[PDB]
Amino acid sequence: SEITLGKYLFERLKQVNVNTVFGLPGDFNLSLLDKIYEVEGMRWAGNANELNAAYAADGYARIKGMSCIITTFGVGELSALNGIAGSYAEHVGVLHVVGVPSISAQAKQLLLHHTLGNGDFTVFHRMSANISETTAMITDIATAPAEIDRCIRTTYVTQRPVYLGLPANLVDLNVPAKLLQTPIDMSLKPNDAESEKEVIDTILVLDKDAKNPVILADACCSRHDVKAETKKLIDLTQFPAFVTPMGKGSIDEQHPRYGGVYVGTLSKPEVKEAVESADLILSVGALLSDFNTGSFSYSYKTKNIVEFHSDHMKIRNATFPGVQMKFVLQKLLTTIADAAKGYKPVAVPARTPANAAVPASTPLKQEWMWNQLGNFLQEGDVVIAETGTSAFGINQTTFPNNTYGISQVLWGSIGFTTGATLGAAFAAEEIDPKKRVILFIGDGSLQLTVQEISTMIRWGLKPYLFVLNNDGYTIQKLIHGPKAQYNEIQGWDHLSLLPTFGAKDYETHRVATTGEWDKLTQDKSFNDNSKIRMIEVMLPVFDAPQNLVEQAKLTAATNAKQ
């Protein structure tokens, strides 16, 4: 008949397919955490710090749909904020629950630990409101279940973080269990019928008239859950389809009509030409950040641009506020095959040639490696690349179909990927134990978040941790200060990290040549995700993908400009 408010939270999370909860304990959340163990199929990660926990919640949300992190008042929540902010920037639905002091402690303005010593229990909530879609600070048991449901709905449908403050005393108060028998509404509201109809009809007419239409899939294609619709759009139209760095993985790269990665002036020449020659651009989920675009270098020759967005549409100069692309895309599928019936297929650019055979002893280089990496990948992989040479290089890697890419192109917080790897691995394990999680992280970035490897070990998760050892911050050495001491790092014994954190079942490997790379990555044993692995990749100090070399120049000039 009745259930505690705390247990209610976890029953709801279970209902929306959140089965791992991230964060760290503190006195203000201990009673809440007890309730996780009362709900079958729910687990507590036990993270090594709160920033890493937030990065992990982000990775989990990307793979699973949404996530939850629980921290403690003041010290826990503020530690998480850079993780939360990146989830806001990149449209990832993370529910941040904070255990806060009891209603009686607040009213008395007790001078408690984890406060600023000034009796203000609102300050941290106010800070988080700047990087949250919405917030709730629970004060009343009577409306608490509805507020929890609102927070969960909002997280999922907006794909932005939400803040939920839960006083320690209130988590043990009873609420009606029958509320759980009615699901949370997790669907978008329908579009205005007339605006949506106008949008669809206009697009259909533009399509019918187009001789060289192209589809360009970007970040929000993935973040706002229109990958299936976009796949169908590609199939029904047969139009050339391109992807951006931030959207990579959102469309299938083995599809015959896939044309490559468009990055404005930093694209391969054949890709730049094929996109920019279009007489109609169907742009799905654009997010035109500097690193996503070669510092805003798009040069479309057409004005016939259709922008699909989560919350609005644009066609040429016409804006349609509130018209959500999810339903526009779904409804377009009804008639688009007929609209596109007269289309004579335009050729798409060929895939970059495979690497030529070279002696085994050939030292490893970045360009070779990213072009070779496609041999190792398999359908279903999660492929995560850290800001630095890795994020820029992965753009040159060809993915199998059904590859989930994670690259934080906009927020760009180094260290993100160690935590994101943990969260992605938990989610992948829940979906299919055979799904591999593959990380490319720099030696510099690893240092910021290295302890989260501990949490991977404790749960027996089996990611591939490729660490690019180029003796420091190479991306920055190219931007400014190639020999500057601030671009150098203390040298760690990377392969000792796993046993130092208590790993028992693991493998470590070092690769420095093309022969060593191929021998390891082609090995059948290595390709089974049977245990956690670290692979230290030895690369030259100043070696970087050519797109990064060019971006670095642009970024340096942007910052130095008067």
Cβ neighbors of 219 (< 8 A, separation 6 or more) are: 90, 91, 244, 246, 247, 285, 286, 287, 292, 409, 410
- CA quadruple 197, 199, 205, 208: dihedral positive or negative? negative
Q: Which 3 state secondary structure label does DSSP give 94?
A: strand
Does position 545 interact with ligand TPP (CB under 6 A)? The reply is: no
Does position 161 interact with ligand TPP (CB under 6 A)? The reply is: no
Restricted to residues 420-449, the positions that interact with ligand TPP (CB under 6 A) are: 442-445
Instruction: For tokens 């941040």, name the residue.
Output: 96
In whole angstroms, the minimum distance from the beta carbon of 47 to ligand TPP comes to 10
In the structure encoding, which two tokens stand for residue 556, read together?
């340096």
Q: Site map for ligand TPP, 356-395, x if CB under 6 A?
A: ------------------------------xxxxx-----
- CA quadruple 425, 430, 434, 435: dihedral positive or negative? negative
DSSP H helices in 225-264: 227-237
Restricted to residues 402-461, the positions that interact with Mg ion (CB under 5 A) are: 442-444
Are the beta carbons of 140 and 110 closer than 8 angstroms?
no
Are the beta carbons of 224 and 385 closer than 8 angstroms?
no
For 141-181, give the DSSP string. Answer: TTTHHHHHHHHHHHHHHHTS-EEEEEETTGGGSEEEGGGGG
Residue among 28 and 156 whose Cβ is closer to a copy of itself: 28
**Alpha-carbon radius of gyration of the chain:** 24
In whole angstroms, the minimum distance from the beta carbon of 88 to a copy of itself comes to 6
In whole angstroms, the minimum distance from the beta carbon of 410 to a copy of itself comes to 6
Report what 449 binds from a copy of itself, Mg ion, ligand TPP, none; CB cut-off 5-8 Å by kind: a copy of itself
Q: Which 3 state secondary structure label does DSSP give 310?
A: coil
In whole angstroms, the minimum distance from the beta carbon of 475 to ligand TPP comes to 3
Report what 94 binds from ligand TPP, Mg ion, a copy of itself, none; CB cut-off 5-8 Å by kind: none
Which range binds Mg ion by CB under 5 A, 93-101, 201-209, 404-412, 474-482? Answer: 474-482
Residue among 403 and 474 whose Cβ is closer to ligand TPP: 474
How many residues are listed for the chain in this entry?
562
Restricted to residues 258-287, the positions that interact with ligand TPP (CB under 6 A) are: none
In whole angstroms, the minimum distance from the beta carbon of 534 to ligand TPP comes to 15
In the structure encoding, which two tokens stand for residue 14, read together?
């279970």
DSSP letter (8 states) at residue 279? S
Residue in 541, 559, 411 with CA at minimum distance from that of residue 477: 541
Report what 445 binds from a copy of itself, ligand TPP, Mg ion, none; CB cut-off 5-8 Å by kind: ligand TPP
In the structure encoding, which two tokens stand for residue 78, read together?
């503020």
Q: Site map for ligand TPP, 3-32, x if CB under 6 A?
A: ---------------------xxx------
Distances (CA, A) of 207 to 278, 317, 329, 343: 12, 17, 13, 9
Residue among 93 and 442 whose Cβ is closer to Mg ion: 442
In whole angstroms, the minimum distance from the beta carbon of 228 to ligand TPP comes to 33
Q: Which 3 state secondary structure label does DSSP give 249?
A: coil
Does position 101 interact with Mg ion (CB under 5 A)? The reply is: no
CA atoms within 13 A on the CB side of 393: 29
Restricted to residues 64-123, the positions that interact with ligand TPP (CB under 6 A) are: 72, 75-76, 79
Tell me which of 470, 521, 529, 551 binds ligand TPP, using CB under 6 A: 470
- Rounded Cα–Cα distance for residues 3 and 103 (Å): 20
Residue among 282 and 468 whose Cβ is closer to ligand TPP: 468
The residues that touch Mg ion, with contacts defined as CB under 5 A, are 442-444, 470, 474
Interaction site with ligand TPP (CB under 6 A): 24-26, 50, 72, 75-76, 79, 386-390, 412-415, 442-445, 468, 470, 473-476
